[PDB]
């Protein structure tokens, strides 16, 4: 029914600075306490800071003390968050949220929330992967078979493609979605399950292609 709209998010290097703003519509901005909340990708909600309409009561989470500053301009219907000395740990979607509760009764809640603005703190640049063999084992996927694979480590940006034996080996192949690491680089793994009797006779090669860095690796995966 009423709306908050955040802006200012983007890509910033570690140690850099960024200023977020939030504009209100549908309610009188100057009548309410306002809050910032953030959420790292795949993680939970973490309150950042609060400010009363008068700006006379201001609170911060310990994780941002000394680095972030909350402020508001009631005449411009805007909330701000100045973010200094940014770290990779600060990568998150940042939400504006109104507290329409009763401060005197310590009866608070957040309604509405903005759509959020994404802050990415990263100095990653184009990087080709290191490719490492994952030597076969029959301890977890067996019954006459062995699992082997390739680790495609620390590349940027997406995507990478993986095939096995130039694409002639397809059954039993499981390529896992990449993880985005706190370093800002991606890693992924691809595994294939093969007959354990073939481990001595059949060569297995993972074909890794990373077009953004113009890198290709053909990694032989030999038994130990």
């Amino acid at each position: 029914e009423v709306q908050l709209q955040e802006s200012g998010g983007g890509l910033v290097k570690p140690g850099g600075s960024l200023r977020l703003s939030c504009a209100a519509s549908g309610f009188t901005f100057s009548s309410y306490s306002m809050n910032w909340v953030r959420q790292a990708p795949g993680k939970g909600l973490e309150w950042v800071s609060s400010i009363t309409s008068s700006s006379s009561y201001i609170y911060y989470a310990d994780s941002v003390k000394g680095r972030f500053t909350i402020s508001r301009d009631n005449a411009k219907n805007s909330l701000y968050l100045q973010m200094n000395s940014l770290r990779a740990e600060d990568t998150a979607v940042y939400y504006c949220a109104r507290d329409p509760g009763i401060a005197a009764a310590d009866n608070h809640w957040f309604d509405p929330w903005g759509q959020g603005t994404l802050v990415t703190v990263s100095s990653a640049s184009t990087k080709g992967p290191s490719v490492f063999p994952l030597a076969p084992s029959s301890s977890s996927k067996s019954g006459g078979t062995a699992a082997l694979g390739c680790l495609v480590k620390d590349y940027f940006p997406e995507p990478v493609t993986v095939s096995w034996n130039s694409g002639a080996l397809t059954s039993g192949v499981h390529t896992f979605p990449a993880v985005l690491q706190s370093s800002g680089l991606y890693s992924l793994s691809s595994v294939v399950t093969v007959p354990s009797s073939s481990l001595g006779t059949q060569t297995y090669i993972c074909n890794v292609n990373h077009k953004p860095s113009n890198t290709k690796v053909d990694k032989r995966v030999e038994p130990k």
Partner: protein, 209 residues
Amino acid sequence: YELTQPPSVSVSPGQTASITCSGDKLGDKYACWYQQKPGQSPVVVIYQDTKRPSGIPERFSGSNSGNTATLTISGTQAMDEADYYCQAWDSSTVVFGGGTKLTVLGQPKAAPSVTLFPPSSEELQANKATLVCLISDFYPGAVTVAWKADSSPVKAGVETTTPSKQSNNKYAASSYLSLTPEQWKSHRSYSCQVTHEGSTVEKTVAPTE
């Protein structure tokens, strides 16, 4: 101050889902509940322990007794599948629970298969070490992954994906532990522990093969 929620609750369609949130003296505090669906902002579904915002369906209700706040969804529907967060104030600090993924079961539960790979000798020669824990074919799509150095927790170096949907509608995830060569060689073993629906699978690898 913390609020503790179960990481995941699962319910058959039409059954009652109950999500709990425990906190010290939580009976003295007003509890709030938020629903968050993938790619969207949170929305308040309960505030002031029991009050339901207008537009929230009547099958949602809240309570706060015995120092646990409970979100109850009767006749749970597929559209109720989401993450739910409880929230309370502690001396001007705003505290959220860790979140509960509610799955409305569209198929029977499936236990994960777990494969753990040690660092390759090649990577160790490159003065690096990565352990790879691959988790597949589980449903609902919620797991807890914990790494162990010998029998002790790991304090840093873990990177775990959110579960993603496979072709067969089960879920997969992966976890990576980055170590120094000295850390790898100076422990008897490392372990990947995967917990799913209250059951745990633990795989262990050692430098001495």
